[PDB]
């Protein structure tokens, strides 16, 4: 059906993957939307933060976690930092 990525439809350095009759834009950190046109922000899906989102100086999101969790390497997820983190059922 042809390569839909030939016309370079991804903004902001997104990587274009050709599917059947469509493309995906895999966005670099900080961008989202079908064409990587959006800046990740706290008011769209909580800035993709698993727990808490804030705007930092330099107007980028920063994610954070409650006590007993640490921010994962992906800078979004909150992973246990202690054996029995708050609010989880484990039986």
């Amino acid at each position: 059906d042809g390569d839909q990525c030939e016309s370079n439809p991804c903004l902001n350095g997104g990587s274009c993957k050709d599917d059947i009759n469509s493309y995906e834009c895999w966005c670099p950190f900080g961008f989202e939307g079908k064409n990587c046109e959006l800046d990740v922000t706290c008011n769209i899906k909580n800035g993709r933060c698993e727990q808490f989102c804030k705007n930092s100086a330099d107007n980028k999101v920063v994610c954070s976690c409650t006590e007993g969790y640490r921010l994962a390497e992906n800078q979004k997820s909150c992973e246990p930092a202690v054996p029995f983190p708050c609010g989880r059922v484990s039986v």
Binding site: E50, Q51, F52, T66, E67, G68, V82, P83, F84, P85, C86, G87, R88, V89, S90, V91
Partner: protein, 235 residues
């Protein structure tokens, strides 16, 4: 709790029961190894409180229970029963020896003010306790839980006594029958977000169960988070 069901062991591992001259007169929630949050109206001057974590059936020995004495009681500084029994209805209890955290004994998460409120507004919380299983009925032997929907402010104020909406919220069903009861006060109103539970309220008064109103009233935890964090900090 009226109209709920039996918790399974370890389903609500942040839940504690408060025991005095009578057992299970109130509940509470584990903030951390040393601290419980409960309702101020549960913790009068002169009376001893014993806390039990890891409790399931209050008349059987499950080998999960951890009993602790209370060495310090901090009612919220605005609490005054003479003006309103259920306003600023929140208190912290310090335990004599730390709880040993495990699958049966686990703290509830407490988010900041903004996120606590967001979570509340998702509109459905879990309430739990060993309170009466119907009005004037027997105390529960096995921990009960119930899902209660958030009730809008206007509806809350029309149908319930002593409500100060800044500090409190209503929850329950328009058709009634399902509420916290005497013995549940001080226990948790909790909101689960993608497998992690957050404290959104303190059970204050089950007006429906008490036949004084159509809904349960709850202390809004969002208003008290900084105080909780400050007082209970272990470091």
């Amino acid at each position: 709790v009226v109209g709920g069901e039996d918790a399974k062991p370890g389903q609500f591992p942040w839940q504690v029961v408060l025991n005095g001259k009578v057992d299970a007169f109130c509940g509470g929630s584990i903030v951390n190894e040393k601290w419980i949050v409960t309702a101020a109206h549960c913790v009068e001057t002169g009376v001893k409180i014993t806390v039990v974590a890891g409790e399931h059936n209050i008349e059987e020995t499950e080998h999960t229970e951890q009993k602790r004495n209370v060495i310090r009681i901090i009612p919220h500084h605005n609490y005054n029963a003479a003006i309103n029994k259920y306003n600023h209805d929140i208190a912290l209890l310090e335990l004599d020896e730390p709880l040993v955290l495990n699958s049966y004994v686990t703290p509830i998460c407490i988010a900041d003010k903004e996120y606590t409120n967001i979570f509340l507004k998702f509109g459905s919380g879990y309430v739990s306790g060993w309170g009466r299983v119907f009005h004037k009925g027997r105390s529960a032997l096995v921990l009960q839980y119930l899902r209660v929907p958030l009730v809008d402010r206007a509806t809350c104020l029309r149908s319930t006594k002593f409500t100060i909406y800044n500090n409190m919220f209503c929850a329950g069903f328009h058709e009634g029958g399902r509420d916290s009861c005497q013995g549940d006060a001080g226990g948790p109103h909790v909101t689960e977000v993608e497998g992690t539970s957050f404290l959104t309220g303190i059970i204050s008064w089950g007006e429906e169960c008490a036949m004084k109103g159509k809904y349960g009233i709850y202390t809004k935890v969002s208003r008290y988070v900084n105080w909780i964090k400050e007082k209970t900090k272990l470091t």
